[PDB]
Design a protein around this nucleic acid. Structure first.
Ligand SMILES: [Mg+2]
Ligand SMILES: [Mg+2]
Ligand SMILES: [Zn+2]
Lengths: 81, 246, 49
RNA sequence: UUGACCUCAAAUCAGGUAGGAGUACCCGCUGAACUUAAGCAUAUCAAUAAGCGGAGGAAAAGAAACCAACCGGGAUUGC
RNA sequence: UGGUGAACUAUGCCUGAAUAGGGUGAAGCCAGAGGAAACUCUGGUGGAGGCUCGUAGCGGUUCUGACGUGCAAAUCGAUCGUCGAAUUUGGGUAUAGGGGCGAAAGACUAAUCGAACCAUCUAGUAGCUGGUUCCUGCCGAAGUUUCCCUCAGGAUAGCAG
RNA sequence: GAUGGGGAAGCUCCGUUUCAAAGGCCUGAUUUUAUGCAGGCCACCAUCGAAAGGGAAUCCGGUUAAGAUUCCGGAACCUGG
RNA sequence: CUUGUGACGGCCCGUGAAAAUCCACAGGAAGGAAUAGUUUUCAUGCCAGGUCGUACUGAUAACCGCAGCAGGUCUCCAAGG
RNA sequence: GUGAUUUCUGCCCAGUGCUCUGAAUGUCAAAGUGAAGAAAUUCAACCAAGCGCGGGUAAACGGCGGGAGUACUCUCUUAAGGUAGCCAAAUGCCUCGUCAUCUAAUUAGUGACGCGCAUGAAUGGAUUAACGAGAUUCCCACUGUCCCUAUCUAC
RNA sequence: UUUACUUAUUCAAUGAAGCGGAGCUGGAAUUCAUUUUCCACGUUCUAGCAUUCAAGGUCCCAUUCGGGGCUGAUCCGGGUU
RNA sequence: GUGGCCUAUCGAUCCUUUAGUCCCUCGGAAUUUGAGGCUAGAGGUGCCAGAAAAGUUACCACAGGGAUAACUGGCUUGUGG
C-alpha cells in the first residue's frame, strides 16, 4: 500500500514560508530556504538555473529606488530647485 | 559495492551511545595537594545503579579545602563499600577497601581497582564489574610498579598513579544466561545500537565481502591482514592462530 | 629493523612471558629444527667417515 | 614613590570603510564527462561547461632582465 | 557537474499515548500428616510467564473468491496470524545518493531503486529502425574483385549518368 | 547553532567551554551629581529547540442567526507595584 | 462500570529525563525600643495586568489520495437487557 | 562464524591466506658513498620495509586416494586418506533401486539395506520434548468435491 | 649503536593552589670533631559541624563608631604542574 | 653459378639497434662529447595488410533482427509406423 493509503498520512509540512522571498521553501528542520538560501548572506542562484535567474532577477519587482537613477544621472545629480 | 556496516559505524549517526540516564563520568578525585602530601576523608552518601553499566556507582562527598563548599565525586563502587563509610584518599591513607592510595605506597600482592595509567587521568584500568589489578612488583629507583591487568598482561606504570583498594562490585554477572532475545534487547537498548547482528555471509555481495553465492560460505580465508584497508577488515583481523585449542 | 620492534613493543617484558609467547607462536620449534639441521650436517660427515 | 618607552587591550569613544545585487564583456582559481579516435586507456572534447573569488565603463596589458643576427628594430593593445 | 528531498518508508534517540473477558496455575507463605533424621505427602493461599483461547488494535494465510477500462495505480468479502510485549503509535529530532538505513528481501530512501529527484553539459553518440513534400522528358544499374576486429558497415575496381 | 580560535583557493567546515584579558550583583556612599569614585560578592560562560513534557492564577448561571472558562450578572484567585 | 488515589507485592545483565522556578534550614552581617519604636511571610485597604490565536469541519462531502473516491489519517466521554 | 537443550565435534599446515621476538644476502627504490670523465653522464659497492628462506595456525578458506593378500594386513601415491554417525534423506544419475508394510490395485508414504553419480562432523554431524497460516502420507468423523444434478432468495 | 640536556615540537590536568631549593622542629643516625646523611615536618572507633580579609599577640593611628601594618600561616626563585 | 631440381617454408608505420657515407644539422661564432638526419639490415605483430585486454548476470537494460534458433504450418521421409 505505497500509493493511495500512503498518501493519506501526509499532514506535516517540510517547508514553510521564507522571509526574504515568501516562497514556502524554508525547510523547518534545516532552517534554510531552498530557493533563495536564507539565512545565508548571498542569494541562491546558479548558472544552470538560468530560467530561475530570469524569474528572480532585477526588474521583476518594483525597483523602488533604481527606477530613478537613470533620470537623476541624465539630469546630472543636480541639487536645489 | 556499498559501504559496509562496520564502515558506517564510525560516522556516529545512529551508532552513538545512549547516555540519557547516566549519572556522570565515574572518575577519581583530582590529585591536587592533599592527595599527594597527606589524605582527605569523604563520605559515601548513596550507592546507585548506572544505566548501561554492570557495576554500581558510589557518590562520595568531600569538603573543598580552599572554599567553604562540598564536592561530590562519582566513584565506581568496590565490593564491600557501604553507605556512610568514610573513604580516605591520599598518600598517607590507611590500607583498607575503598581507600584511594597511590600505587607506590602499597606492598606486594595488593589488589586494587580503577587504576590510573599515568598519575592524574582519574581512573583507566579495571573498571568493569569484578575486575581488578594486582601489584606484581616495585622499582624504587626509576620509580615504577609492575601490575597484572585483567587481561593477564603485565604493565609497568608510574608509582604515583592511584587506585582504589579492592575489587569492583557486581562481579559474576556474565555467568547468568540471558535466555531471551528480549533480555539482550534490553541490555543493548541502554548501551548502543549494535544489536541484532546479521551475518555477512547471509547478505548480498554488494553489502559485505562474505555475501553472495549459491551457498552461504565465506569464499576466501577469513583471516584478514593488519595492512588491509577499510571495507576489507571483516573477519578475524591479524589472527596469529585460529581454531579451538585443546 | 627487528631491533626497533622489540624496543617499540617488547621493552616491558620478563622471561617467563617471553618463553610463553614464543612457545605460543612456534618460533622455538623453528630454532630447534635449525640447530637440529646443523646436527645432522655434522652427523652425515661422521657417518661418511 | 613618580614619570617615560615598548607591546597588548577596552569603550553605544571622534570620524570613516567592507559585506549584498548585477555579471553580456573583463582578471584569476578550480574543473569534468558526453563526444572523436569507426573498440579503448595517452590524446581529443578542453587549459571548455558547471562551481568559487574580484572590478570597470571598459577591464587587462604597457614603457624591455624585448625582438633579433640585419645596413638592425624599439612600450602595450587590435586588424 | 551543481543542487533538492526522511510529509511515504528504513533505523537510533527525546517526549507523550493505547491495549475486553477467559484458561493454565510458577516462586514465596499457611495448616494437617508421616519420618529417627534428612526430608517427603495432602489441602489451601498467592498470581509468575518474550504462556495460552479470544475483542479493540497490528498484520496479511487461503479462496489462487469479488473486482480487474475497479470504490481503489493494490481495494472489498469470508477465512486467517498475533494480541502485555523484540508490542502498536503521535509529535520532536538525527542519518542524503556510490551516500544513507537494512532481525538481510538488493529491501526501503515521497506511486521512482541492482544507485532517488531536479536543472545543465545536451540538439550526447548510433555501422541500427521509421519518415523524407510538384510535373513531364531522356538515359539507366548492382548484389561481383581485393583489403579492413571485416561478416547488418566502409574503402577500391566494376556497372551508370 | 554564533563567538574565541583552528582548517579550507573558496562557497564555507570543525567545535559549544574550548590554548579568550569572555562579565553583572547588591548594599550603598555622595547628596557641585551624576552615577563615577568607598567598598564587598560571584564565575555560569550566546541563543534556538515541546500548542502531548515542566509551568502563578476562574468558576457558576444567562445570553447570539452565527462567539464564549473570553460577553453580561454574581462570586473568586494570582503576579507585579 | 469508568476513573482518581493509598499502602503493598512481582519483574529486570531494563532500576525506568533535564532545566526554569519556588520554599526551608545552617550562619550571624547589619539594623535596632521606652515615651518610644521595630515588624507588612498576620488581617484589611489601593492600582495595573500588554501582544498573537479563539468561527467551523475533523471525515462514506470541509484533510490527503487528479473527485462530493467503500482507501488512509492521533485522541477524550461511553446508558439498559 | 555457528545457531535452544542432549551427545559429540575425527585426520590433514602440501596449496591459498593469516601470523612470528628466526636468520640474514639471495631480490633490492630515492637520497647518500666511491671510481672514470672536461662535464652532462656511466659504472659499481652499500642497501629500509616487503618479497625469497625457516616455523606456527583448520570452531582460517578448504581437502579427506589407488593395487594386492586373506572386516583385517601389506604395498604404491599423497598434506591426509571420510573417523563417529546418517541415508534412494529437501542431498542417489542409473531409479518407478531391492526387501517388508500400507491398498483390490500405489512412480506416493513408512521401516530397513548401502562400493553413497556427488552423505558426513561449528561448510557443523546425529538426536530431540514443545511450538508452526511450513512440506508430505494414512485413519475416524463430515459433507453437492463427485455419481448427477435439481430447487429457492437478494442484487 | 648507547646515553645525557631543555628551550623547539608532542600529550594531559586544573576555577593554572602549595613546584623547586634552603631552613626550623622531632626521630633514627655514627659522629671521630661538628655534624655525614635519611625519614617525617597538626587530620582514622561514629552518615554532626567547619565560611564573614581569623581569634589571640604586637605596633601605629588619634579613639569612637573604629581603621591600618607585622605575626599567627619560615625564607628565596615568579618555571601552573 | 645472384642459395637449395621446380611448385610452400613468412612480416608495415612508430621506437630501439647495427653497418655504410665519416657525409649533413644542432639556426649569434667555433672545438670536443652528446643528440638528430640520409642509405641498407635486425628486434614483430600466426586474428599472419599488423588493437595493449578476465569473468558473471535467474536483478538486468537499449538499438535492432524473422539476415538467426526454441512452436504450429510448408518441402523431404533417413528414422518411426
Ligand atoms: Mg538496531
Ligand atoms: Mg560468499
Ligand atoms: Zn527564501
Amino acid at each position: 500500500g505505497k500509493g493511495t493509503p500512503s498518501f493519506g498520512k501526509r499532514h506535516n509540512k517540510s517547508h514553510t514560508l521564507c522571509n526574504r522571498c515568501g516562497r514556502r521553501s524554508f525547510h523547518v528542520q534545516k532552517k534554510t530556504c531552498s530557493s533563495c538560501g536564507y539565512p545565508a548572506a548571498k542569494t541562491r542562484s546558479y548558472n544552470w538555473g538560468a530560467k530561475a535567474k530570469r524569474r528572480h532577477t532585477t526588474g521583476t519587482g518594483r525597483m523602488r529606488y533604481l527606477k530613478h537613477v537613470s533620470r537623476r544621472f541624465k539630469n546630472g545629480f543636480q541639487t536645489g530647485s | 559495492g556499498r559501504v559496509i556496516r562496520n564502515q558506517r559505524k564510525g560516522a556516529g549517526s545512529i551508532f552513538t551511545s545512549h547516555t540519557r540516564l547516566r549519572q556522570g563520568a565515574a572518575k577519581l578525585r583530582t590529585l591536587d595537594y592533599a592527595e599527594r602530601h597527606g589524605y582527605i576523608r569523604g563520605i559515601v552518601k548513596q550507592i546507585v545503579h548506572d544505566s548501561g553499566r554492570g557495576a554500581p556507582l558510589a557518590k562520595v562527598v568531600f569538603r573543598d579545602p580552599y572554599k567553604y563548599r562540598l564536592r561530590e565525586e562519582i566513584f565506581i563502587a568496590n565490593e564491600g563499600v557501604h553507605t556512610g563509610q568514610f573513604i580516605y584518599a591520599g598518600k598517607k591513607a590507611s590500607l583498607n577497601v575503598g581507600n584511594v592510595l597511590p600505587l607506590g605506597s602499597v606492598p606486594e600482592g595488593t589488589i586494587v581497582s580503577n587504576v590510573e595509567e599515568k598519575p592524574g587521568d582519574r581512573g583507566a584500568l579495571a573498571r568493569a564489574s569484578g575486575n581488578y589489578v594486582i601489584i606484581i612488583g616495585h622499582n624504587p629507583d626509576e620509580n615504577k610498579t609492575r601490575v597484572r591487568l585483567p587481561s593477564g598482561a603485565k604493565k609497568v606504570i608510574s608509582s604515583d598513579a592511584r587506585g582504589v583498594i579492592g575489587v569492583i562490585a557486581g562481579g559474576g554477572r556474565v555467568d547468568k544466561p540471558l535466555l531471551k532475545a528480549g533480555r539482550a534487547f534490553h541490555k543493548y537498548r541502554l548501551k548502543r545500537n549494535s544489536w541484532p547482528k546479521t551475518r555477512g555471509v547471509a547478505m548480498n555481495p554488494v553489502d559485505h565481502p562474505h555475501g553472495g553465492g549459491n551457498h552461504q560460505h565465506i569464499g576466501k580465508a577469513s583471516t584478514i591482514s593488519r595492512g588491509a584497508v577499510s571495507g576489507q577488515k571483516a573477519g578475524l583481523i591479524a589472527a596469529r592462530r585460529t581454531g579451538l585449542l585443546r | 629493523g627487528k631491533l626497533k620492534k622489540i624496543q617499540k613493543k617488547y621493552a616491558d617484558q620478563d622471561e617467563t612471558e617471553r618463553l610463553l609467547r614464543l612457545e605460543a607462536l612456534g618460533t622455538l620449534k623453528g630454532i630447534e629444527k635449525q640447530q637440529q639441521r646443523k646436527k645432522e650436517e655434522i652427523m652425515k660427515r661422521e657417518v661418511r667417515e
